[PDB]
Write a protein that binds this ligand. Structure first.
Ligand SMILES: [Mg+2]
Ligand SMILES: [Mg+2]
Ligand SMILES: [Mg+2]
Ligand SMILES: [Mg+2]
Ligand SMILES: [Mg+2]
Ligand SMILES: [Mg+2]
Ligand SMILES: [Mg+2]
Ligand SMILES: [Mg+2]
Ligand SMILES: [Mg+2]
Ligand SMILES: [Mg+2]
Ligand SMILES: [Mg+2]
Ligand SMILES: [Mg+2]
Ligand SMILES: [Mg+2]
Ligand SMILES: [Mg+2]
Ligand SMILES: [Mg+2]
Ligand SMILES: [Mg+2]
Ligand SMILES: [Mg+2]
Ligand SMILES: [Mg+2]
Ligand SMILES: [Mg+2]
Ligand SMILES: [Mg+2]
Ligand SMILES: [Mg+2]
Ligand SMILES: [Mg+2]
Ligand SMILES: [Mg+2]
Ligand SMILES: [Mg+2]
Ligand SMILES: [Mg+2]
Ligand SMILES: [Mg+2]
Ligand SMILES: [Mg+2]
Ligand SMILES: [Mg+2]
Ligand SMILES: [Mg+2]
Ligand SMILES: [Mg+2]
Ligand SMILES: [Mg+2]
Ligand SMILES: [Mg+2]
Ligand SMILES: [Mg+2]
Ligand SMILES: [Mg+2]
Ligand SMILES: [Mg+2]
Ligand SMILES: [Mg+2]
Ligand SMILES: [Mg+2]
Ligand SMILES: [Mg+2]
Ligand SMILES: [Mg+2]
Ligand SMILES: [Mg+2]
Ligand SMILES: [Mg+2]
Ligand SMILES: [Mg+2]
Ligand SMILES: [Mg+2]
Ligand SMILES: [Mg+2]
Ligand SMILES: [Mg+2]
Ligand SMILES: [Mg+2]
Ligand SMILES: [Mg+2]
Ligand SMILES: [Mg+2]
Ligand SMILES: [Mg+2]
Ligand SMILES: [Mg+2]
Ligand SMILES: [Mg+2]
Ligand SMILES: [Mg+2]
Ligand SMILES: [Mg+2]
Ligand SMILES: [Mg+2]
Ligand SMILES: [Mg+2]
Ligand SMILES: [Mg+2]
Ligand SMILES: [Mg+2]
Ligand SMILES: [Mg+2]
Ligand SMILES: [Mg+2]
Ligand SMILES: [Mg+2]
Ligand SMILES: [Mg+2]
Ligand SMILES: [Mg+2]
Ligand SMILES: [Mg+2]
Ligand SMILES: [Mg+2]
Ligand SMILES: [Mg+2]
Ligand SMILES: [Mg+2]
Ligand SMILES: [Mg+2]
Ligand SMILES: [Mg+2]
Ligand SMILES: [Mg+2]
Ligand SMILES: [Mg+2]
Ligand SMILES: [Mg+2]
Ligand SMILES: [Mg+2]
Ligand SMILES: [Mg+2]
Ligand SMILES: [Mg+2]
Ligand SMILES: [Mg+2]
Ligand SMILES: [Mg+2]
Ligand SMILES: [Mg+2]
Ligand SMILES: [Mg+2]
Ligand SMILES: [Mg+2]
Ligand SMILES: [Mg+2]
Ligand SMILES: [Mg+2]
Ligand SMILES: [Mg+2]
Ligand SMILES: [Mg+2]
Ligand SMILES: [Mg+2]
Ligand SMILES: [Mg+2]
Ligand SMILES: [Mg+2]
Ligand SMILES: [Mg+2]
Ligand SMILES: [Mg+2]
Ligand SMILES: [Mg+2]
Ligand SMILES: [Mg+2]
Ligand SMILES: [Mg+2]
Ligand SMILES: [Mg+2]
Ligand SMILES: [Mg+2]
Ligand SMILES: [Mg+2]
Ligand SMILES: [Mg+2]
Ligand SMILES: [Mg+2]
Ligand SMILES: [Mg+2]
Ligand SMILES: [Mg+2]
Ligand SMILES: [Mg+2]
Ligand SMILES: [Mg+2]
Ligand SMILES: [Mg+2]
Ligand SMILES: [Mg+2]
Ligand SMILES: [Mg+2]
Ligand SMILES: [Mg+2]
Ligand SMILES: [Mg+2]
Ligand SMILES: [Mg+2]
Ligand SMILES: [Mg+2]
Ligand SMILES: [Mg+2]
Ligand SMILES: [Mg+2]
Ligand SMILES: [Mg+2]
Ligand SMILES: [Mg+2]
Ligand SMILES: [Mg+2]
Ligand SMILES: [Mg+2]
Ligand SMILES: [Mg+2]
Ligand SMILES: [Mg+2]
Ligand SMILES: [Mg+2]
Ligand SMILES: [Mg+2]
Ligand SMILES: [Mg+2]
Ligand SMILES: [Mg+2]
Ligand SMILES: [Mg+2]
Ligand SMILES: [Mg+2]
Ligand SMILES: [Mg+2]
Ligand SMILES: [Mg+2]
Ligand SMILES: [Mg+2]
Ligand SMILES: [Mg+2]
Ligand SMILES: [Mg+2]
Ligand SMILES: [Mg+2]
Ligand SMILES: [Mg+2]
Ligand SMILES: [Mg+2]
Ligand SMILES: [Mg+2]
Ligand SMILES: [Mg+2]
Ligand SMILES: [Mg+2]
Ligand SMILES: [Mg+2]
Ligand SMILES: [Mg+2]
Ligand SMILES: [Mg+2]
Ligand SMILES: [Mg+2]
Ligand SMILES: [Mg+2]
Ligand SMILES: [Mg+2]
Ligand SMILES: [Mg+2]
Ligand SMILES: [Mg+2]
Ligand SMILES: [Mg+2]
Ligand SMILES: [Mg+2]
Ligand SMILES: [Mg+2]
Ligand SMILES: [Mg+2]
Ligand SMILES: [Mg+2]
Ligand SMILES: [Mg+2]
Ligand SMILES: [Mg+2]
Ligand SMILES: [Mg+2]
Ligand SMILES: [Mg+2]
Ligand SMILES: [Mg+2]
Ligand SMILES: [Mg+2]
Ligand SMILES: [Mg+2]
Ligand SMILES: [Mg+2]
Ligand SMILES: [Mg+2]
Ligand SMILES: [Mg+2]
Ligand SMILES: [Mg+2]
Ligand SMILES: [Mg+2]
Ligand SMILES: [Mg+2]
Ligand SMILES: [Mg+2]
Ligand SMILES: [Mg+2]
Ligand SMILES: [Mg+2]
Ligand SMILES: [Mg+2]
Ligand SMILES: [Mg+2]
Ligand SMILES: [Mg+2]
Ligand SMILES: [Mg+2]
Ligand SMILES: [Mg+2]
Ligand SMILES: [Mg+2]
Ligand SMILES: [Mg+2]
Ligand SMILES: [Mg+2]
Ligand SMILES: [Mg+2]
Ligand SMILES: [Mg+2]
Ligand SMILES: [Mg+2]
Ligand SMILES: [Mg+2]
Ligand SMILES: [Mg+2]
Ligand SMILES: [Mg+2]
Ligand SMILES: [Mg+2]
Ligand SMILES: [Mg+2]
Ligand SMILES: [Mg+2]
Ligand SMILES: [Mg+2]
Ligand SMILES: [Mg+2]
Ligand SMILES: [Mg+2]
Ligand SMILES: [Mg+2]
Ligand SMILES: [Mg+2]
Ligand SMILES: [Mg+2]
Ligand SMILES: [Mg+2]
Ligand SMILES: [Mg+2]
Ligand SMILES: [Mg+2]
Ligand SMILES: [Mg+2]
Ligand SMILES: [Mg+2]
Ligand SMILES: [Mg+2]
Ligand SMILES: [Mg+2]
Ligand SMILES: [Mg+2]
Ligand SMILES: [Mg+2]
Ligand SMILES: [Mg+2]
Ligand SMILES: [Mg+2]
Ligand SMILES: [Mg+2]
Ligand SMILES: [Mg+2]
Ligand SMILES: [Mg+2]
Ligand SMILES: [Mg+2]
Ligand SMILES: [Mg+2]
Ligand SMILES: [Mg+2]
Ligand SMILES: [Mg+2]
Ligand SMILES: [Mg+2]
Ligand SMILES: [Mg+2]
Ligand SMILES: [Mg+2]
Ligand SMILES: [Mg+2]
Ligand SMILES: [Mg+2]
Ligand SMILES: [Mg+2]
Ligand SMILES: [Mg+2]
Ligand SMILES: [Mg+2]
Ligand SMILES: [Mg+2]
Ligand SMILES: [Mg+2]
Ligand SMILES: [Mg+2]
Ligand SMILES: [Mg+2]
Ligand SMILES: [Mg+2]
Ligand SMILES: [Mg+2]
Ligand SMILES: [Mg+2]
Ligand SMILES: [Mg+2]
Ligand SMILES: [Mg+2]
Ligand SMILES: [Mg+2]
Ligand SMILES: [Mg+2]
Ligand SMILES: [Mg+2]
Ligand SMILES: [Mg+2]
Ligand SMILES: [Mg+2]
Ligand SMILES: [Mg+2]
Ligand SMILES: [Mg+2]
Ligand SMILES: [Mg+2]
Ligand SMILES: [Mg+2]
Ligand SMILES: [Mg+2]
Ligand SMILES: [Mg+2]
Ligand SMILES: [Mg+2]
Ligand SMILES: [Mg+2]
Ligand SMILES: [Mg+2]
Ligand SMILES: [Mg+2]
Ligand SMILES: [Mg+2]
Ligand SMILES: [Mg+2]
Ligand SMILES: [Mg+2]
Ligand SMILES: [Mg+2]
Ligand SMILES: [Mg+2]
Ligand SMILES: [Mg+2]
Ligand SMILES: [Mg+2]
Ligand SMILES: [Mg+2]
Ligand SMILES: [Mg+2]
Ligand SMILES: [Mg+2]
Ligand SMILES: [Mg+2]
Ligand SMILES: [Mg+2]
Ligand SMILES: [Mg+2]
Ligand SMILES: [Mg+2]
Ligand SMILES: [Mg+2]
Ligand SMILES: [Mg+2]
Ligand SMILES: [Mg+2]
Ligand SMILES: [Mg+2]
Ligand SMILES: [Mg+2]
Ligand SMILES: [Mg+2]
Ligand SMILES: [Mg+2]
Ligand SMILES: [Mg+2]
Ligand SMILES: [Mg+2]
Ligand SMILES: [Mg+2]
Ligand SMILES: [Mg+2]
Ligand SMILES: [Mg+2]
Ligand SMILES: [Mg+2]
Ligand SMILES: [Mg+2]
Ligand SMILES: [Mg+2]
Ligand SMILES: [Mg+2]
Ligand SMILES: [Mg+2]
Ligand SMILES: [Mg+2]
Ligand SMILES: [Mg+2]
Ligand SMILES: [Mg+2]
Ligand SMILES: [Mg+2]
Ligand SMILES: [Mg+2]
Ligand SMILES: [Mg+2]
Ligand SMILES: [Mg+2]
Ligand SMILES: [Mg+2]
Ligand SMILES: [Mg+2]
Ligand SMILES: [Mg+2]
Ligand SMILES: [Mg+2]
Lengths: 88, 275
RNA sequence: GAGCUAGCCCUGGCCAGGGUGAAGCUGGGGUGAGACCCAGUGGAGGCCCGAACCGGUGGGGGAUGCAAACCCCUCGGAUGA
RNA sequence: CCCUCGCCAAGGAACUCUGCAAGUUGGCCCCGUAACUUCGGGAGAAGGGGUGCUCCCUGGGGUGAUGAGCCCCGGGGAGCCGCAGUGAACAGGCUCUGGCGACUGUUUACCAAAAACACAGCUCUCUGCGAACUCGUAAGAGGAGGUAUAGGGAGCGACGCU
RNA sequence: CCUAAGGUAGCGAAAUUCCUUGUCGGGUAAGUUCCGACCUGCACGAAAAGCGUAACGACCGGAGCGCUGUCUCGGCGAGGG
RNA sequence: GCUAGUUGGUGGGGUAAUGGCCCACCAAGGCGACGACGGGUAGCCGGUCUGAGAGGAUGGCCGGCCACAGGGGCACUGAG
RNA sequence: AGCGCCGGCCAACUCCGUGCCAGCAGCCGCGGUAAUACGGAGGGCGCGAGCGUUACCCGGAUUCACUGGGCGUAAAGGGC
RNA sequence: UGGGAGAGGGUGGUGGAAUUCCCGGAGUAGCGGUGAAAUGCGCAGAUACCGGGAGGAACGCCGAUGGCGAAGGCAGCCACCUGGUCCACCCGUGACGCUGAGGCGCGAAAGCGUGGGGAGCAAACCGGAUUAGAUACCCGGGUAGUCCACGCCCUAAACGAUGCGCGCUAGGUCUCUGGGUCUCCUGGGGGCCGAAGCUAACGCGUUAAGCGCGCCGCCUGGGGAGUACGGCCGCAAGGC
RNA sequence: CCGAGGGUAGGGCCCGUGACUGGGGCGAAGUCGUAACAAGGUAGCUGUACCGGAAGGUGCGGCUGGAU
């Protein structure tokens, strides 16, 4: 799967402050991570519809956060989706 | 994956073409080609002996290595996969570390860059050739010789394969593409894997013109002829067969078995084809 | 006897000009990614119109002919079997 | 009188087996275009408007040099003449609706071009390779320097529903 | 009663229907043709395929518009005879 | 899904006067699931009938406003 | 001075005629030889220059439920 | 952050039992089948028995009133890839939420297209019975299909005939699976009986059909009829 | 110039009508069988598919709103 180390690296890279876990950017980034990994999975396993539901849920989850983040601070939003290359 | 066309002519509506995706090189090795002398279906007396042939695209013959036991132990790199107008399979250019270059028919799954080798000690991997006796029972195979050193005769068409079913003394039992069960001598070489271009059979010619490109001239029905010409010839208006359906030469053509009874190979054929 | 004619084989040659505008490619849109849509590009096809060329549809003429199959008008194919 | 040709009052298919023949239409630009459809088409559907010449203003391109000149493709005004401006010549009549054949093709050289043959495609069947099958007394050839996703024979004839 | 078994789907006066110009409906002033129907199918029918089908056709039907010396019905003129 | 006087602009014309009301050019806009566009029905209101009320139904007679004058277009005269 | 009604809803009953016929009927239903339900009569009830009928509107209809309804099995949870 | 359970999904492999068929052996007069029969199979050697082989499909025991999933649905075993979910810590973010017309995706079986595969079973079909008849039920055969890949179809007693979310309102008992300190306690599921309450009744009852709020879907007498017409979708069947 | 309208051509919607054809509702005094309600004499119902004079049957899968 996705390892403990790799997750740590993402978290520390988007953490707003030294200990920061669960902030929006960290959440969006963790989701962005899972999303992209699943996307690749589904490209090969087109017939795994059940996991695709998982993908929709993650996408849904990230969407809400980004609306929130963009509601609060447009600046951190624009920089986050750019840092992740997300809009489209 | 066969390629379709939009119906922008009446014929393009149904025409499909091979996608040619496995093909990496579009020119043949000059030292491995020779002219294919077209016959028009005529023999050395000048007579038509196979009807309705001729007028197809000019072709060069690619020399194919149907022996392999020729260069035992010498590995070769798969240099390219090419089109061969003279057969349904694709062909693969081998560069032997020898410096010798030869063609084989391309197996399904063969990759340019990969290495293949022939011999009793060859790994059991796609593209390698071994005597049948050293190939594991159950593995599917192709380009099978029928008698030792006489060259690959069996399972050469696109998409075909034979399967090793068992061993019995000097012989091994194959299921041929036809479903026929047969003993083949163990020293006969075969190449592991199935013949590639498996989608060949899904091609829809689409128009009369395409048959002509292939050297197939229009086939005319016996029922369309006159009694001088054919058993089915004649009759006022359309006519049913009016006798057992027959060849132009008078022999029956629905069911009449034609393989020679007292043929020596009958001792080696275990079960006649299916379907 | 295949210097006519039918088929095939080998090797050459020919097909004015105009029209339609397939795939693909690029860009844009779209989506989680896609499908896909739009534009530009592109230049496919026993595609279209029409000479050469190959034909021979209807009519008229000719009928001890210009001619033992021709002439006029009209008409089919014209990158393809 | 015959041939080839030109025109014709009023009528306009009443001719005749049949509009046969002959008229009509006719190029380009623009507008516009139905059922149905396999979404390509049907389509040049149909139908209609424009079309010459003169002067004035102007937009891009090619060759130059970035300019003049030359050559090419446009646009906008205002006018003039005739019955008539693709002013001659070359240049679809159209629509609705059935039958048959899917289609482009092929044919009775010299009375039949068709609904006939062929055709992609469908199915049956034979053939394990020194294949079956074909030609040959044979040798030898074709099949095929192919190998059952292949080759022969037969019927049916795109496709849809069977 | 008979048969090996008794024609299914679909289509049907049909490139098939003798009686026949069947009957009814449409179109026409008037329609042995044409189109739509009906079905006692003389004598359709499922790869000698059955029923349909966009596009295509110098194929063969039926109707209308346009336009005409095809005609009412013929006249004059030209050139070659 | 609708839209070429269509939506906006500039300039004129026209009116008692604003306005694409009308014209010329410039721009590519305007409207729509809060129902555009299209179809059907209807003149609207004060009121009236009913109903516990809410609501439902209705708008003849009287009053107010609108629209029409056989069907349709048009301007003239005039404070209108 | 007339008109409707007198089985139940709904106020008003008997005799004869008829015998699933003729007929009545708003709903439920009446009529097959002792019919308060058909037809007449006597009598009765209700209105009265009117009485009944047909049509239509609101009511009863919390039967589109805002006031004021529902959806396991009655009609009603969207396959997720 | 640290853990847990599971037929959740996808892909590639792989195991054994049994059925059928084929080969070899051995053997003989029947076998099969039913309520009873007959068709059928069998001296051209069947059935029953032994060994060999081929092939497809489904996974016995475990297995449960069990588990998982949003639903459809998911069951030999291995591996890889991957979804949901629960718990404990109470570490981070700071209302980021609920629902959800349209839209999009998924969606048992049957059915469709192209290609494979085909042992068993089995629409249609053929035959035997049964019966007054028997286009059935039962029996002997038997093709699609059932299976695989890809693409369609989009239905259902697709059911809990019960939309989703949240808060609140006795308990008793069985069970699955976590965490405790392991008596028992506390989470999350799955049942049963029941407090109050609801209900036309039957029944429901902390897995509500009770008491409340939010949003969506839906009903408005039976037939005609999920029909016709229009539209949209589908290759068709036919769906909305 | 615009312009009532007229004319030519081609589309869209709605109404009436049509040989014939499909099923539906009602009638009932008929013919055939008896599919459902009981275990309704093959438990029922169901989506789909194929089939049969008819109700209906069978296959595949589903539900219990199934008696014992
Ligand atoms: Mg998640
Ligand atoms: Mg966003
Ligand atoms: Mg390929
Ligand atoms: Mg394509
Ligand atoms: Mg194609
Ligand atoms: Mg294409
Ligand atoms: Mg075509
Ligand atoms: Mg290609
Ligand atoms: Mg290739
Ligand atoms: Mg080359
Ligand atoms: Mg050379
Ligand atoms: Mg050389
Ligand atoms: Mg050669
Ligand atoms: Mg040769
Ligand atoms: Mg020679
Ligand atoms: Mg010779
Ligand atoms: Mg000779
Ligand atoms: Mg031949
Ligand atoms: Mg030949
Ligand atoms: Mg090749
Ligand atoms: Mg190929
Ligand atoms: Mg093919
Ligand atoms: Mg060729
Ligand atoms: Mg051929
Ligand atoms: Mg032929
Ligand atoms: Mg002939
Ligand atoms: Mg001869
Ligand atoms: Mg002879
Ligand atoms: Mg003969
Ligand atoms: Mg014959
Ligand atoms: Mg004959
Ligand atoms: Mg003949
Ligand atoms: Mg005949
Ligand atoms: Mg003939
Ligand atoms: Mg013939
Ligand atoms: Mg013929
Ligand atoms: Mg025959
Ligand atoms: Mg004959
Ligand atoms: Mg015969
Ligand atoms: Mg022979
Ligand atoms: Mg041999
Ligand atoms: Mg010659
Ligand atoms: Mg010659
Ligand atoms: Mg040459
Ligand atoms: Mg050449
Ligand atoms: Mg030349
Ligand atoms: Mg040419
Ligand atoms: Mg050209
Ligand atoms: Mg050219
Ligand atoms: Mg050209
Ligand atoms: Mg272009
Ligand atoms: Mg390209
Ligand atoms: Mg393009
Ligand atoms: Mg071109
Ligand atoms: Mg171009
Ligand atoms: Mg062409
Ligand atoms: Mg061309
Ligand atoms: Mg052309
Ligand atoms: Mg020639
Ligand atoms: Mg010539
Ligand atoms: Mg000629
Ligand atoms: Mg010719
Ligand atoms: Mg001629
Ligand atoms: Mg002519
Ligand atoms: Mg001629
Ligand atoms: Mg003439
Ligand atoms: Mg002539
Ligand atoms: Mg003549
Ligand atoms: Mg002559
Ligand atoms: Mg000539
Ligand atoms: Mg000529
Ligand atoms: Mg011409
Ligand atoms: Mg020509
Ligand atoms: Mg032409
Ligand atoms: Mg052509
Ligand atoms: Mg042409
Ligand atoms: Mg050309
Ligand atoms: Mg051509
Ligand atoms: Mg050529
Ligand atoms: Mg002349
Ligand atoms: Mg005249
Ligand atoms: Mg005139
Ligand atoms: Mg006329
Ligand atoms: Mg006229
Ligand atoms: Mg006439
Ligand atoms: Mg006449
Ligand atoms: Mg005619
Ligand atoms: Mg003509
Ligand atoms: Mg003309
Ligand atoms: Mg012309
Ligand atoms: Mg002409
Ligand atoms: Mg039309
Ligand atoms: Mg047409
Ligand atoms: Mg179209
Ligand atoms: Mg086309
Ligand atoms: Mg035109
Ligand atoms: Mg047309
Ligand atoms: Mg014109
Ligand atoms: Mg002009
Ligand atoms: Mg000029
Ligand atoms: Mg002039
Ligand atoms: Mg130059
Ligand atoms: Mg210049
Ligand atoms: Mg003019
Ligand atoms: Mg013109
Ligand atoms: Mg002129
Ligand atoms: Mg000329
Ligand atoms: Mg002229
Ligand atoms: Mg033309
Ligand atoms: Mg004409
Ligand atoms: Mg037409
Ligand atoms: Mg025609
Ligand atoms: Mg017809
Ligand atoms: Mg006819
Ligand atoms: Mg036809
Ligand atoms: Mg043809
Ligand atoms: Mg023909
Ligand atoms: Mg066809
Ligand atoms: Mg054809
Ligand atoms: Mg046909
Ligand atoms: Mg053709
Ligand atoms: Mg051609
Ligand atoms: Mg042709
Ligand atoms: Mg032809
Ligand atoms: Mg001749
Ligand atoms: Mg001839
Ligand atoms: Mg001759
Ligand atoms: Mg001759
Ligand atoms: Mg001749
Ligand atoms: Mg001729
Ligand atoms: Mg001819
Ligand atoms: Mg022709
Ligand atoms: Mg001719
Ligand atoms: Mg034919
Ligand atoms: Mg022919
Ligand atoms: Mg033919
Ligand atoms: Mg076919
Ligand atoms: Mg096929
Ligand atoms: Mg031979
Ligand atoms: Mg011979
Ligand atoms: Mg011989
Ligand atoms: Mg030889
Ligand atoms: Mg040879
Ligand atoms: Mg040879
Ligand atoms: Mg050879
Ligand atoms: Mg071959
Ligand atoms: Mg043919
Ligand atoms: Mg034929
Ligand atoms: Mg079709
Ligand atoms: Mg018959
Ligand atoms: Mg039958
Ligand atoms: Mg008939
Ligand atoms: Mg008739
Ligand atoms: Mg017919
Ligand atoms: Mg007949
Ligand atoms: Mg006769
Ligand atoms: Mg007749
Ligand atoms: Mg006759
Ligand atoms: Mg008649
Ligand atoms: Mg009439
Ligand atoms: Mg008539
Ligand atoms: Mg008539
Ligand atoms: Mg006629
Ligand atoms: Mg005729
Ligand atoms: Mg007819
Ligand atoms: Mg009759
Ligand atoms: Mg026939
Ligand atoms: Mg025949
Ligand atoms: Mg025929
Ligand atoms: Mg036949
Ligand atoms: Mg045919
Ligand atoms: Mg037909
Ligand atoms: Mg047709
Ligand atoms: Mg043609
Ligand atoms: Mg033709
Ligand atoms: Mg006319
Ligand atoms: Mg004349
Ligand atoms: Mg004269
Ligand atoms: Mg003259
Ligand atoms: Mg003269
Ligand atoms: Mg003269
Ligand atoms: Mg003269
Ligand atoms: Mg202004
Ligand atoms: Mg005024
Ligand atoms: Mg305006
Ligand atoms: Mg303007
Ligand atoms: Mg503009
Ligand atoms: Mg609304
Ligand atoms: Mg109105
Ligand atoms: Mg009104
Ligand atoms: Mg009330
Ligand atoms: Mg009103
Ligand atoms: Mg009133
Ligand atoms: Mg008033
Ligand atoms: Mg008015
Ligand atoms: Mg007026
Ligand atoms: Mg009046
Ligand atoms: Mg007036
Ligand atoms: Mg009263
Ligand atoms: Mg009573
Ligand atoms: Mg009362
Ligand atoms: Mg009372
Ligand atoms: Mg009486
Ligand atoms: Mg009364
Ligand atoms: Mg009595
Ligand atoms: Mg009495
Ligand atoms: Mg009463
Ligand atoms: Mg009374
Ligand atoms: Mg009074
Ligand atoms: Mg009321
Ligand atoms: Mg109310
Ligand atoms: Mg309420
Ligand atoms: Mg209620
Ligand atoms: Mg609710
Ligand atoms: Mg219900
Ligand atoms: Mg539900
Ligand atoms: Mg974790
Ligand atoms: Mg045995
Ligand atoms: Mg055994
Ligand atoms: Mg169990
Ligand atoms: Mg359970
Ligand atoms: Mg659960
Ligand atoms: Mg905290
Ligand atoms: Mg804080
Ligand atoms: Mg939705
Ligand atoms: Mg499904
Ligand atoms: Mg299935
Ligand atoms: Mg199926
Ligand atoms: Mg099928
Ligand atoms: Mg299938
Ligand atoms: Mg098919
Ligand atoms: Mg299949
Ligand atoms: Mg089988
Ligand atoms: Mg039976
Ligand atoms: Mg019986
Ligand atoms: Mg009977
Ligand atoms: Mg039976
Ligand atoms: Mg059975
Ligand atoms: Mg069986
Ligand atoms: Mg079938
Ligand atoms: Mg099938
Ligand atoms: Mg089928
Ligand atoms: Mg599938
Ligand atoms: Mg749905
Ligand atoms: Mg259940
Ligand atoms: Mg549930
Ligand atoms: Mg439901
Ligand atoms: Mg909901
Ligand atoms: Mg524990
Ligand atoms: Mg516990
Ligand atoms: Mg619990
Ligand atoms: Mg309980
Ligand atoms: Mg209680
Ligand atoms: Mg309640
Ligand atoms: Mg509590
Ligand atoms: Mg409890
Ligand atoms: Mg729960
Ligand atoms: Mg309840
Ligand atoms: Mg109803
Ligand atoms: Mg429907
Ligand atoms: Mg339905
Ligand atoms: Mg419809
Ligand atoms: Mg539904
Ligand atoms: Mg006007
Ligand atoms: Mg007008
Ligand atoms: Mg006028
Ligand atoms: Mg009727
Ligand atoms: Mg039953
Ligand atoms: Mg019963
Ligand atoms: Mg029963
Ligand atoms: Mg069923
Ligand atoms: Mg039937
Ligand atoms: Mg019967
Ligand atoms: Mg049955
Ligand atoms: Mg079942
Ligand atoms: Mg279920």
């Amino acid at each position: 799967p996705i390892t403990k180390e790799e997750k740590q690296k993402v978290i520390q890279e988007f953490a707003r402050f030294p200990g920061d876990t669960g902030s929006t950017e960290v959440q969006v980034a963790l989701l962005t991570l899972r999303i992209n990994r699943l996307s690749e999975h589904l490209k090969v396993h087109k017939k795994d519809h059940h996991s695709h539901r998982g993908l929709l849920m993650m996408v849904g989850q990230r969407r809400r956060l980004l609306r929130y983040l963009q509601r609060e601070d447009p600046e951190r939003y624009r920089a986050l989706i750019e840092k992740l290359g997300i809009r489209g | 994956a066969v390629k379709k066309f939009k119906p922008y002519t009446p014929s393009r509506r149904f025409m499909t073409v091979a996608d040619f995706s496995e093909i990496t090189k579009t020119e043949p090795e000059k030292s491995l080609v020779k002219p294919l002398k077209k016959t028009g279906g005529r023999n050395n007396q000048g007579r038509i002996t196979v009807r309705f042939r001729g007028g197809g695209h000019k072709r060069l013959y690619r020399i194919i290595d149907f022996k392999r036991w020729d260069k035992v132990g010498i590995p070769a790199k798969v240099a390219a996969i090419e089109y061969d107008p003279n057969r349904s399979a694709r062909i693969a250019l081998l560069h032997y570390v020898d410096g010798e270059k030869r063609y084989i028919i391309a197996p399904d799954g063969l990759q340019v860059g990969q290495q293949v080798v022939a011999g009793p000690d060859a790994p059991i991997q796609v593209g390698n050739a071994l005597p049948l006796r050293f190939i594991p029972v159950g593995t599917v195979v192709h380009a099978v010789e029928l008698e030792p050193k006489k060259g690959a005769k069996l399972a050469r068409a696109a998409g075909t394969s034979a399967q090793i079913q068992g061993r019995e003394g000097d012989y091994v039992i194959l299921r041929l593409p036809s479903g026929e069960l047969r003993k083949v001598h163990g020293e006969c070489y075969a190449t592991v894997g199935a013949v590639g271009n498996a989608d060949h059979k899904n091609i829809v010619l689409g128009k009369a013109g395409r048959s002509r490109w292939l050297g197939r001239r229009p086939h005319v029905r016996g029922a369309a002829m006159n009694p001088v010409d054919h058993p089915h010839g004649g009759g006022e208006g359309r006519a049913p067969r009016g006798r057992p359906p027959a060849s132009p030469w008078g022999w029956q053509t629905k069911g009449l078995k034609t393989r020679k009874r007292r043929k020596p190979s009958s001792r080696f054929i275990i079960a006649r084809r299916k379907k």
